[PDB]
Write a protein that binds this DNA or RNA. Structure first.
Ligand SMILES: [Mg+2]
Ligand SMILES: [Mg+2]
Ligand SMILES: [Mg+2]
Ligand SMILES: [Mg+2]
Ligand SMILES: [Mg+2]
Ligand SMILES: [Mg+2]
Ligand SMILES: [Mg+2]
Ligand SMILES: [Mg+2]
Ligand SMILES: [Mg+2]
Ligand SMILES: [Mg+2]
Ligand SMILES: [Mg+2]
Ligand SMILES: [Mg+2]
Ligand SMILES: [Mg+2]
Ligand SMILES: [Mg+2]
Ligand SMILES: [Mg+2]
Ligand SMILES: [Zn+2]
Ligand SMILES: [Zn+2]
Lengths: 100, 114, 222, 716
RNA sequence: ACGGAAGGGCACCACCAGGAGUGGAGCCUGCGGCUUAAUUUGACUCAACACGGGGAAACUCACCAGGUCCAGACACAAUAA
RNA sequence: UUAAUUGCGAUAACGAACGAGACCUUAACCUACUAAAUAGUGGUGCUAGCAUUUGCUGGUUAUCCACUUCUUAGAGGGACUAUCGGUUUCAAGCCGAUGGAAGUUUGAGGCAAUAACAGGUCUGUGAUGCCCUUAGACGUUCUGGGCCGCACGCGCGCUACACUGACGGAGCCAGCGAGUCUAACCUUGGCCGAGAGGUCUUGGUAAUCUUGUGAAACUCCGUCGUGCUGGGGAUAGAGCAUUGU
């Protein structure tokens, strides 16, 4: 069946929480389970002048947004993967599931 | 369609085949996917579709109440009502006669007649 | 089909667009921030305000049209977006609500000195460790100047500023120009309950329990 | 049905203007257990009538050819498959034909098996057998043997038996012997009915049985089939996740669809009478309701207590006088035949009430008097069948109207009146409505105003079935574990893992008393604390010795299976046993059993209890002394005096004591058997000799000084 | 506050010991000036001059030679099928 | 004495607050934990070349088996100037040696107090008071110019003025990033064309495809030879395409 779930939230502490109950849900159900894979962190950077006008010393500001993404692979019949998606939803943690 | 995917859902996750709801030999429920990809039973490999006095009488009677059972389920929204002895039961269809009081002015006219 | 690099950025702008819409509509309903939580097939938005009845209204009239307003602009299908209404806990400890209170007093002709002390006094009485309100503009004269009002103590540098200080800025429109209002409130670290419970430079030592010498070798057999 | 965005609680003043305070409450605690599964009635128009069964022997019987329409999903799903399924059947909509799917399930694959049926009450047991003695055995050639506390068949008959019907309590005793009783090896399918009684007292007994087969199936590595027979249950998913059923098959139909439609009415009665005066206020409105709703059709009224079975009859017959026919609807045209049935009537209310068309039934009559009220109603001679709530489990009475006469039956545990649980009155409506006799049926639920809104809101919806094992959880922990399956507490957590409690404890922590944390981790220490409580409450009974993480099956815990043991009884009499036990000493010990505490002591019995205390051979005041001194009201004192009366053949002052004596004598043999095994292990030969003299005296009702020859018939 | 007043301590937007450079040449680019109808404009030491995120063919565009449109809500009076 | 009103202390002051520091992000250390065909490693299968005698270089996605040293992380640890020797009312501290991945607060940053400037900004804003315009309107829109205009003076800059070079062949190594939905982005591959570029497809919403970004400076073998010269590449003319009306 090869169920794959990807999680791409910005805040990591809940993202580690969501990946914590999922991994133990499979083993407690005696499911062949593939460990979570933590992809390299994506650092989205924007650099801009601080001043609104054109006056002053050329001071530059850097802003960063971090994207933490993991995936976990599951292999099991549909009747248990369908009872995973509707739960483990917490604020600001994007979750999607792909079949096959 | 010739698909070999034997969908044995029995209508759990798919709509049932209207023409062939079940197996007439071993009772397996055949859904639309199961009916479309094969006309044979999944379990006992029996044909699903062949290529009132005469009809069995109580067989026709069985579906009469069965349709009522479906009718009861379809019309079960209002069967949950409680009669009570404190409900006004305004009996108005959707409004109090357009929110307008002149039908009882005749009763006032009747009272003027009295 | 949008990449996750652009999806999260487009999600933050959705939060940014949705945030400024409420502060311009519920300005007299005490809007105090919004939160967006995404669930498959069901998107929910939590409005936080001081007056939960006005945000809801009779039969949820206001929240329905506000939910319906979001539907039209963002092209969300009916039944996908649902708005909530929730009161704000510890209204004295929210800078945004107290920023509105400062603006409210000025527009009614109240004195700048007395009104400013009123905002900081309520915040201090509500359990805040520190509070600071800054008023800038043409005060009693054409020549503009700033007047800072504060109580307790507020940190200014380091990471804990983000953790403990909430900042609110609200422009005020008056007949003589524009008066700026800035409110910073520092809550007690002892009630944070999310992350740090104290300043990084606070060290607390558990008092040891004294015990007199036994003065005699003895055994308690079992 | 469409969930609102929030729930709003508005409080407004009554005199001032604008004194309003509103709260908006969100509910995001919506998990899959918090749902109603249900199944829409789909288009399955064509059935498989009889002929589509491929067995001439079965098709030659059951002349019902039209196949059960309310089996829409079921039909032949379990006929061939070996997968567990849950079936919710409201009312008597196939309770008999579906229960016979066990033979259709796998008996053809392997014949000559001993599939066991389970019923929650012995009243069902009699009818689950008698109806099938002329239905299955004469045609299938398979015999069925009853297994109850009153029947002790030969083990060879039980081994060769094909079907076994047993209450969960009686199945527990034989299931205590799973290790050595070679009889239980042929279990392939287990079927039980009326399974939503876990909230009741007997539910925990049945609940722990299911977890037993789960461990049997798990270790032995072969599946054991199950089948759940019940009515509409709100929390179907949790039961589905505990019964071990799979996706293919789940039967949850609501009470909306029934063979006979049900009409229900609500009425309120004033809140200034506690229990007693609110029978005169309610008896009269019952009379008008019977005539209005059941003019010429049978009615049925459910009184609260045993005495109210009489009081309602007294007033209703009195109110029946003020109309045309005082003996209305007697349905006895022949006066000569009228006196025929009245001849068999014994005494008391039945003598002067059966002539009015009203029948009475309660557990205070002759065993044939209870039946007499039924056969007359079987051919519709009597109309009113005023009875107790305990009759909603026995014979299926085809009545039309069910009346809830009052509410809030008394509970002895709280010395007060408590609201009736929403498990019995819901089933009590099932008697209303006669299949193929009348179109629709009516029901009325008369209640106090404070509870009037509660039943309007939730009577149709129903409530989740809850597990009440953690009131007797200390007793049945050693039911399956005293064999020596687990030695350490680490796996003791595993022993309770697949019980029904975890299916509701984590889902509904509030009901079970959890108030600290609702998370699965938060409940983990709470459930372990209960496990820690269970082992420590067994320590003061000095039955188990702890070696840290290890538990020890001591000789005191050695007798916990093969025989019912209440554990708490062991410690009470542990410091009393001695080799030279006298006859007087043991008579005190027999009445000290905890199981005898259930004997009721009616008001004013102390006066008559004291009278026979001196009349008894061993007075209570001279027997229960110092630490063993007991109050005269205590049932142990009453039980001690009852045994002496039986030995001395002393006539009891009232007939009520006779029923108690029969109950006391019923458990006398099994309770006395406990001391035989205990004394045998200790080698107290003198005590053992004393034991044999007791049941001989008890069986023949004669003292040890009496001549055994006089016991023979015709001899005083 | 200032001192071509004293005392103590610091800094490669200071110096020493040096490095590599700019200033010299061509070219890109900004500023001033001159020109023009317009060559739109801000910033005059550090703290402006590859700065206005200003690398402008049209847009941007704010300047010039010209041409359209009214997006003047609403209320009042007038003309008026 | 410290980078520090940083500390030891003295003491008509005691007790505090802000700032510094702590904090946060990043860089390095772990053959320690959980791992990971979207990263690899060794071996087993099929297979190419040479020696053939045990090998070396390799190729292989539905060929598997085991692992996380290298690569990514999440949770942790690790440094506090540790030990020692000197100097100091012998206090804070400082110097030196050893050990250490790391010992100039470890390096580098974010944040960063009070009081001010009539510093810049009305041309970022539907943020603005007041003033001006408000219908051949300073509004908007369309066409074409200009902001590039050139006697001249300055700043930020890039190319060099040569053999530590230039040119021609080969050698061949990074890291930070980015990439298409109602769009047409990053483009590998085949073919055509000096070249620029053009055509047909392909993979990629992306650790998996561009991409080992096979980058340049640089390394080696050859030509030139102290010559405004094969240094230098503006100034000008002709032709071939692309961006875009
Ligand atoms: Mg220096
Ligand atoms: Mg120098
Ligand atoms: Mg140079
Ligand atoms: Mg400076
Ligand atoms: Mg250009
Ligand atoms: Mg232009
Ligand atoms: Mg233009
Ligand atoms: Mg190979
Ligand atoms: Mg030293
Ligand atoms: Mg630092
Ligand atoms: Mg500005
Ligand atoms: Mg310019
Ligand atoms: Mg510059
Ligand atoms: Mg690289
Ligand atoms: Mg050249
Ligand atoms: Zn299907
Ligand atoms: Zn079939």
């Amino acid at each position: 069946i090869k169920i794959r779930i990807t999680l791409t939230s910005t805040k990591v502490k809940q993202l580690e929480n969501v990946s914590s109950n999922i991994v133990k849900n499979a083993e407690q159900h005696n499911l062949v389970k593939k460990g979570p894979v933590r992809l390299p962190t994506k650092v989205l950077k924007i650099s801009t002048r601080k001043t609104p006008n054109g006056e002053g010393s050329k001071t530059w500001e850097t802003y960063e947004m971090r994207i933490h993404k993991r995936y976990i692979d599951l292999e099991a019949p549909v009747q248990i993967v369908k009872r995973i998606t509707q739960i483990t939803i917490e604020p600001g943690v994007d979750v999607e599931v792909v079949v096959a | 369609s010739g698909s070999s995917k034997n969908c044995n859902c029995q209508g759990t996750r798919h709509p049932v085949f209207d023409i062939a709801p079940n197996c007439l030999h071993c009772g397996k429920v055949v859904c639309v996917i199961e009916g479309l990809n094969k006309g044979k039973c999944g379990h006992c490999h029996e044909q699903l579709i062949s290529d009132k006095a005469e009809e069995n009488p109580e067989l026709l009677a069985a579906q009469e109440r069965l349709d009522r059972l479906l009718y009861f389920q379809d019309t079960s929204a209002e069967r949950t009502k409680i009669i009570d002895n404190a409900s006004d039961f305004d009996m108005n269809q959707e409004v109090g006669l357009w929110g307008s009081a002149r039908e009882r002015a005749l009763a006032l006219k009747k009272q003027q007649r009295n | 089909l949008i990449s996750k690099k652009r999806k999260l950025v487009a999600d933050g702008v959705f939060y940014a667009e949705l945030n400024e819409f409420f502060t311009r509509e519920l300005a007299e309903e005490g809007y105090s921030g919004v939160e967006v939580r995404v669930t498959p097939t069901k998107t929910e938005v939590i409005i936080r305000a001081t007056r939960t009845q006005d945000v809801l209204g009779e039969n949820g009239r206001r929240i329905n049209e506000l939910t319906l307003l979001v539907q039209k602009r963002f092209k969300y299908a009916p039944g996908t977006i649902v708005l909530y209404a929730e009161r704000v806990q510890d209204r004295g400890l929210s800078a945004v609500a107290q920023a509105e209170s400062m603006k409210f007093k000025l527009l009614n002709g109240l004195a700048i000195r007395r009104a400013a002390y009123g905002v900081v006094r309520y915040v201090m009485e509500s359990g805040a460790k520190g509070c600071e309100v800054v008023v800038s503009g043409k005060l009693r004269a054409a020549r503009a100047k700033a007047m800072k009002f504060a109580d307790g103590f507020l940190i200014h540098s380091g990471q804990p500023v983000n953790d403990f200080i909430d900042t609110a800025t609200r422009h005020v429109l008056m007949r003589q120009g524009v008066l700026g209002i800035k409110v910073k409130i520092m809550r007690d670290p002892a009630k944070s309950r999310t992350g740090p419970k104290a300043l990084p430079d606070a060290v607390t030592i558990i008092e040891p329990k004294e015990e007199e010498p036994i003065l005699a070798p003895s055994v308690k057999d079992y | 049905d469409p969930l609102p965005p929030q729930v709003v609680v508005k409080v407004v003043s009554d005199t001032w203007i604008g004194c309003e305070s509103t709260h908006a409450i969100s509910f995001q605690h919506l998990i899959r257990p918090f749902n109603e599964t249900l199944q829409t009635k789909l288009l399955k128009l064509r059935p498989l009538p009889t002929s589509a069964l491929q067995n001439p022997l079965i098709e030659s019987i059951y002349p019902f050819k039209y196949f059960n329409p309310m089996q829409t999903m079921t039909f032949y799903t379990l006929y061939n498959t070996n997968e567990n399924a849950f079936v919710g059947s409201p009312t008597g909509s196939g309770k008999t034909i579906v229960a016979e799917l066990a033979i259709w399930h796998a008996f053809k694959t392997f014949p000559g098996k001993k599939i066991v049926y389970i019923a929650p009450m012995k009243a069902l047991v009699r009818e689950r057998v008698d109806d099938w003695r002329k239905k299955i055995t004469p045609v299938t050639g398979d015999k069925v043997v009853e297994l109850t506390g009153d029947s002790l068949p030969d083990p060879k008959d039980v081994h060769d038996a094909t079907i076994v019907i047993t209450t969960p309590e009686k199945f527990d005793g034989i299931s205590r012997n799973w290790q050595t009783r070679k009889f239980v090896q042929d279990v392939s399918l287990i079927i039980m009915d009326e399974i939503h009684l876990l909230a009741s007292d007997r539910g925990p007994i049945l609940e722990m049985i299911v977890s037993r087969m789960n461990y049997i199936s798990s270790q032995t590595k072969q599946p054991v089939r199950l089948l759940g027979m019940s009515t509409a249950v709100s929390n179907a998913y949790d039961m589905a996740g505990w019964l071990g059923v799979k996706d293919h098959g789940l039967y949850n139909f609501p009470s909306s669809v029934r063979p006979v439609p049900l009409k229900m009415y609500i009425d309120g009665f004033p809140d200034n009478l506690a229990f007693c005066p609110l029978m005169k206020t309610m008896n009269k409105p019952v009379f008008m309701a019977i005539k209005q709703h059941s003019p010429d059709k049978p009615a049925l009224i459910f009184v609260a207590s045993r005495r109210q079975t009489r009081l309602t009859a007294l007033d209703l017959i009195h109110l029946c006088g003020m109309e045309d026919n005082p003996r209305r609807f007697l349905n006895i045209d022949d006066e000569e035949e009228l006196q025929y049935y009245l001849s068999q009537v014994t005494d008391d209310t039945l003598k002067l009430s059966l002539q009015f068309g009203i029948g009475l039934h309660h557990a205070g009559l002759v065993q044939k008097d209870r039946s007499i009220s039924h056969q007359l109603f079987q051919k519709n001679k009597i109309q009113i069948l005023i009875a107790t709530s305990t009759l909603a489990w026995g014979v299926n009475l085809p009545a039309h109207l069910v009346i809830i006469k009052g509410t809030q039956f008394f509970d002895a545990k709280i010395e007060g009146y408590r609201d009736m649980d929403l498990t019995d009155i819901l089933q009590m409506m099932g008697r209303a409505g006669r299949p193929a006799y009348d179109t629709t049926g009516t029901a009325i639920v008369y209640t106090k105003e404070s509870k009037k809104m509660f039943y309007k809101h939730f009577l149709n919806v129903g409530f989740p079935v809850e597990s009440s094992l953690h009131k007797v959880l200390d007793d049945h922990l050693g039911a399956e574990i005293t064999s020596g399956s687990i030695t350490n507490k680490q796996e003791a957590l595993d022993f309770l893992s697949w019980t029904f409690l975890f299916r509701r404890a984590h889902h509904n922590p509030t009901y079970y008393g959890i108030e600290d944390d609702t998370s699965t981790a938060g409940v983990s220490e709470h459930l372990s604390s209960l496990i820690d409580s269970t082992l420590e409450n067994l320590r003061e009974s000095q039955c188990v010795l702890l070696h840290g993480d290890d538990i020890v099956a001591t000789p005191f815990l050695s007798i916990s299976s093969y025989y019912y043991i209440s554990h708490l009884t062991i410690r009470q009499l542990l410091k009393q046993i001695h080799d030279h036990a006298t006859f007087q000493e043991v008579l005190r010990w027999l009445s000290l059993a905890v199981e005898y505490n259930e004997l009721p002591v009616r008001g004013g019995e102390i006066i008559m209890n004291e009278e026979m205390s001196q009349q008894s051979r061993y007075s209570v005041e001279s027997t229960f002394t110092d630490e063993f001194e007991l109050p005269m009201w205590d049932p142990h004192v009453k039980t001690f005096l009852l045994l002496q009366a039986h030995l001395s053949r002393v006539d009891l002052p009232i007939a009520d004591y006779i029923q108690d004596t029969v109950s006391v004598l019923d458990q006398s043999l099994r309770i006395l058997q406990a001391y035989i095994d205990v004394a045998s292990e200790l080698g107290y030969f003198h005590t053992v000799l004393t034991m044999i003299k007791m049941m001989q005296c008890i069986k023949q009702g004669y003292w040890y000084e009496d001549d055994p020859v006089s016991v023979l018939p015709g001899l005083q």
